[PDB]
Design a protein around this ligand. Sequence first.
Ligand code: NA
Length: 129
Amino acid sequence: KVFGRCELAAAMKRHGLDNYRGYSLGNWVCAAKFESNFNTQATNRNTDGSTDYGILQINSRWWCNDGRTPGSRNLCNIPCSALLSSDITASVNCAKKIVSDGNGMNAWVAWRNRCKGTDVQAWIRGCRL
Ligand code: NA
């Protein structure tokens, strides 16, 4: 599923991501924009052989099981495929664990490089929330 900007902001808010660990909703929408262009089916293969999955490009090295990332963990206790669902519940629940891990949203290299410090409220501007 390719979400609309305000459609995703609403789904993220409903699942309690708005101000989670102090990150305003526009931070999460900005990260999703640059990670996946709001596409739940986004995938990216890493040089190390891990894969990133879903709207927030959650990686198989730590967070999900894909059966093909030697040495990896599955700390969100999900198949990585769950992160490609039209239903963002698994992605949001796992994102909550990741952003709690010590480095906040720096865990998402695209958030640090493209969202951090910018006017992220622009990502929810005009949305009925
Ligand atoms: Na894994």
